[PDB]
């Protein structure tokens, strides 16, 4: 028997008895990070004669019978897609692969600034900026470029990359963000660490990212598009920057609609989150100069060198 569609089994697949059709369905769904949308009550019962009808119902029944997601282990424009997926996944570990921990430094209600969390947050920021430049290098054709223009693009997009990446680390149930070493902070600790007025809006952005259901690939491509932008000032070769960013846009669209058949309207939305990212980073850049005087020592080298 097949616990999903009541069909002849072919063995125990992914944790339960399943037929070949549901096996291929679950493997195709997990490998390609598919997103299904039901056009009914999501109640659609799946059996021998009623199959499909709704893909979200079939996958939902696969997870209800107990299939293990863990057990699972045109092309011209998709190559760079997989390349950027590799680069972003190797320059920023995803939230569900960090053994995260906590702290208790100024964790109840807000203060103007905590020096210790500003310290740990400062070394974390320097680290993540280094890995941001590493993500920039592994982009197709970014190395073979004018050094002054690479510095221009990184100087212009560094904060946007930081906000997007740190907002892909948000936990809605705890209202917490997690850094690259497992350090998990709540909204109050994020404020006290040196976010201040940014906090409320940054977290806002985080929630605005939740309905979009972005994965690591879409986040990497969006990061590259924010980096490779022909609208940055003081560019020596801006037309080649625009030409370099066109295939990133097209690949992002092809991927987004590849993972979402029933929502062919998510590419303009995910792309239009940049419109908010611009204002957020635009106020953060001067949030740095507000942090200039509140610290007794000085600003770390890469942070001030890349944010001014």
């Amino acid at each position: 028997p097949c616990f999903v569609c009541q069909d002849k089994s072919s063995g125990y697949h992914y944790g339960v008895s399943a037929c070949e059709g549901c096996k291929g369905f679950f493997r195709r769904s997990i490998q390609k990070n598919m997103i299904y949308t039901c056009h009914r009550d999501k109640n659609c019962v799946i059996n021998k004669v009623t199959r499909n009808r709704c893909q979200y119902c079939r996958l939902q029944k696969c997870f209800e019978v107990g299939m293990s997601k863990e057990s699972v282990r045109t092309a011209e424009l998709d190559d760079l897609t997989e390349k950027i997926r590799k680069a972003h996944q190797e320059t920023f570990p995803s939230l569900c692969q960090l053994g995260k921990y906590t702290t208790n430094s100024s964790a109840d209600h807000r203060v103007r600034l905590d020096l210790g969390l500003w310290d740990k947050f400062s070394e974390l920021a320097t680290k993540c900026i280094i890995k941001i430049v590493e993500f920039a290098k592994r982009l197709p054709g970014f190395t073979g470029l004018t050094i002054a223009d690479q510095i221009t693009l990184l100087k212009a997009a560094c904060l946007d990359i930081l906000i997007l990446r740190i907002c892909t680390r948000y936990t809605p149930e705890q209202d917490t963000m997690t850094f690259s070493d497992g350090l998990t902070l709540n909204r109050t600790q994020m404020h006290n660490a040196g976010f201040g007025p940014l906090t409320d809006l940054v977290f806002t952005f985080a929630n605005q990212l939740l309905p979009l259901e972005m994965d690591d690939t879409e986040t990497g491509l969006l990061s590259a598009i924010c980096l490779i932008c022909g609208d940055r000032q003081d560019l020596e070769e801006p037309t080649k920057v625009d030409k370099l960013q066109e295939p990133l846009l097209e690949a992002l669209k092809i991927y987004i609609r590849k993972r979402r058949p029933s929502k062919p309207h998510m590419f303009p939305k995910i792309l239009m989150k940049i419109t908010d990212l611009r204002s957020i980073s635009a106020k953060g850049a001067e949030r740095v100069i507000t942090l200039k005087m509140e610290i007794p020592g000085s600003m770390p080298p890469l942070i001030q060198e890349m944010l001014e």
Binding site: I130, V133, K137, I147, Q150, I151, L154, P301, E305
Partner: peptide, 9 residues
Amino acid sequence: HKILHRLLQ
């Protein structure tokens, strides 16, 4: 801008 140059080359 030493950091950027040393990092790139």
